[PDB]
Write a protein that binds this ligand. Sequence first.
Ligand SMILES: OC[C@@H](NC[C@H]1NC[C@H](O)[C@@H]1O)c1ccccc1
Ligand SMILES: *[C@@H]1O[C@H](CO)[C@@H](O)[C@H](O)[C@H]1NC(C)=O
Ligand SMILES: [Zn+2]
Length: 1015
Amino acid sequence: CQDVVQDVPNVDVQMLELYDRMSFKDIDGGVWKQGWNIKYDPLKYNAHHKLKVFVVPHSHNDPGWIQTFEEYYQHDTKHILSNALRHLHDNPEMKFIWAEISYFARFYHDLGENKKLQMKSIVKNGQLEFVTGGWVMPDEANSHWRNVLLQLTEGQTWLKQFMNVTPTASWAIDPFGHSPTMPYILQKSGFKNMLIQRTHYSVKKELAQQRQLEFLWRQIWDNKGDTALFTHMMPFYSYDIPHTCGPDPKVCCQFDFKRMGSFGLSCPWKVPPRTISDQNVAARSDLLVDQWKKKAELYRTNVLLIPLGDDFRFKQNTEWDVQRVNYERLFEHINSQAHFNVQAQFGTLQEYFDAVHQAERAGQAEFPTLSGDFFTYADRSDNYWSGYYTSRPYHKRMDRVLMHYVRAAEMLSAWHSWDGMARIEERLEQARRELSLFQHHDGITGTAKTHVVVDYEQRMQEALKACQMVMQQSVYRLLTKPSIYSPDFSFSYFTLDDSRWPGSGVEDSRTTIILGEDILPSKHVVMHNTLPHWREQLVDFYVSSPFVSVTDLANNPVEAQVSPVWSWHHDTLTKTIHPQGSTTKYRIIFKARVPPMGLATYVLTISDSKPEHTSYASNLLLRKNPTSLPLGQYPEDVKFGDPREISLRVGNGPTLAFSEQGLLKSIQLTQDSPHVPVHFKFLKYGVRSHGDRSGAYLFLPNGPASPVELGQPVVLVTKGKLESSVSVGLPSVVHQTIMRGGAPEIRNLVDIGSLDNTEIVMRLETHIDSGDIFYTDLNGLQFIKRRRLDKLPLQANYYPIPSGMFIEDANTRLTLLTGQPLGGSSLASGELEIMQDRRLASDDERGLGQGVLDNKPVLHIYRLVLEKVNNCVRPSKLHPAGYLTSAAHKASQSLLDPLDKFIFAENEWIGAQGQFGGDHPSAREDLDVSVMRRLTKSSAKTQRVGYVLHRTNLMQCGTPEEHTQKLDVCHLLPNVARCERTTLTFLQNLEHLDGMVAPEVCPMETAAYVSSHSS
Ligand SMILES: OC[C@@H](NC[C@H]1NC[C@H](O)[C@@H]1O)c1ccccc1
Ligand SMILES: *[C@@H]1O[C@H](CO)[C@@H](O)[C@H](O)[C@H]1NC(C)=O
Ligand SMILES: [Zn+2]
């Protein structure tokens, strides 16, 4: 195993280093506005060294943006594909590349057999080529790596089954900035090449000057280079025709033949395209070949890529003709005029890469190595695209909830083979596809029109219902005596109970467990743990009486705590935000201990009085002018007091101090230790009154944030033996700090209401001497070092926080983990900040055509981990990566993959069992079974189950933590007959494993295995 901490990789381009050196000046470079006037030596190419040009027709099809997926399919994409089939069939030398498999599968299943066969033929002969082959072209900032893999696998599994092809070249022309998580996943999925486009204009200039636009992109910690993937970065401002033929858009636009008028398009540079004829082909060729030779100067080989396309192009038959015929006339002339020393033709992306590598092998070029990322993107001036790291945060949080539900549904149902009548495969495919669709770069990014966001939300709700159905049928099968099990596959044996989604204050949708002497004495509940290690975690349920006790299925009492159900209300009468307690429902909390990838059953029983093993939280409402807060049968009266500072400690955990406004002020790790200043504060950013306006994509603040005026907020303190909390009703945010004995949990119920042109940020102020350094994660996969640069504007220093961020000095580290992707930064030493929501009245000129005024209440969740790190073995100062500690990693897992809770629906569960998975191996803490998926339906003689195993890298800080079992996923199901290592999409077998044992992976590695069972 490579050491991912102690060996700084030696690369030619390291993006953090490049950023420290770059000036980022935005000067007018001439016709290539953000470059320079390219010059080339006409004698560079000759009879023995020609420039080979591949013109690659393409059509960017967004799976929802200005219209919904289905609206675009009906209005545009079905015609593009139907006409591509006809035109490619009839013109053998014409080529076309296709990226979005969600649209291709929607089209293909509606085709008659005759056309399916014609389609398969143009794919087999190479005219139509799939690039990447994912369900969508995903966002790379907010997406979790698990969902990037899910959507890639959904598209490629469909392509293997129906087109018999697996792309090895990726095409990502539109995500707003790029992440090294892509080459990581692609290289472990059989890819050999990838292409990107949206990188900062200053980066394109810098790399173009050094001919470093093609590089071997390896991970930041990869010393050896085995993760490297050849990458081509396009050089210009856009992937449209004016910015893909060469440096001068006024010239290139004249070679977009759809812009002469009848299609309602024109050239903004004021010179229109002209139909190629024998009288102008020599002059037109001279102009075009000159653009090509200038673009070729930016690269190292004599093979040039010229994309030919734009958004939803190649629709009309007349458009196919106009582009094809004109380019055919240019090719015939250019290729026959020896003086140009060019051979040009339509080609595919793979053809381009194959020719580049043939040139490389011929010794004509060596490529530089590169590590780092390409955030935060700016396409021009100070227009940095950091706004979409936060836009539509409700759906960003929903993405993470569904991510976990899909994993849990696939894993719970994988243990058995199911009859077709159970509709398990059907519901899982629906769920995987709706979550995969949302990975689109206008889905999770929050950059689609309002009605499109509604469509994605509706699709995800249907996916959550599908997951619940699969999960509850699976739990019933796994925990019911076999000879008693009698399923009705349409019945709800259990309902899921989720405490954090949509969340208290967002939707009152949790069901209360109704117990009563005259109706039902007790109720069974079941917890599932999708992680491969034993886990204890407090769980809570709503119950109709405070006199409830808990037992495990051996009838052993389990200590529990009962607290009131508090809801916050913006009282329009008193103009205050304050809590109301239920007089009919209560919360019961207790620790559930669940096996690795297993289930544990508990029983809640009502009694007429306080149970011996159930305690009751005290409650203290701090506000001047209080009024009573009756709580029905709750046995402890609420206490009142004027606002004041307070201190709380649960268990032997940390002691937290709060201001009189209910916000954290300090954390004391242990009895002796100091009270470390850690101050939460809410501030607001505004919008510029002159110049460019912030919108769904861009963050263009009108200066540093200003504190939210808090007034005298109402603060609620609940103190219990198992769980305590401090909640406060601030303007636009009900802020809650929860303590269960370890790192606190923070929950923000964010309702920006009608505050136009406002972005609400949550900031942490500490003493930590972090300087200008902070760390943020990439797709929940790795932490990258960031350096705040005062030479760049504030918005450029905002980065995606898909799952966590931290600051540290020699001795102390503060890590904030998130349950949803949001934007954030460290704008001053000792600070961390993360945006909560943004409401913007104006459009930001990137095509969306509306502001962001459809905000809705969202419950954001976090864990806050303050730790001493002076004893940790950390990377050297020159290493570009950072790594979490065990506690921060576990805190992240508690947010992303919590225990699932099931409430038995009927009155009695006959044949109920107490546990499942007690014999499953409890793997080392840094290892996860990211995916468990049965790959075969019930009619297959040989069943196959796929596993994706991911091992992260945790810092060594002297905490032994040992004695763990080896996890061999290939023996998790009985009767294993074969075990193979496969690509991450499970589509190619890479290694036949001896003894049918799947070995564990190295830190920072991800491997996939498929076990075969004869059963
Ligand atoms: O690349 C330019 C073109 N594309 C904008 C792209 N980015 C956001 C979406 O995913 C879309 O595909 C465009 C079209 C229409 C109006 C303005 C700009
Ligand atoms: C799928 O592609 C492989 C490529 O080697 C080919 O051998 C096989 O016949 C194809 N399967 C069919 C008939 O679709
Ligand atoms: Zn797009």
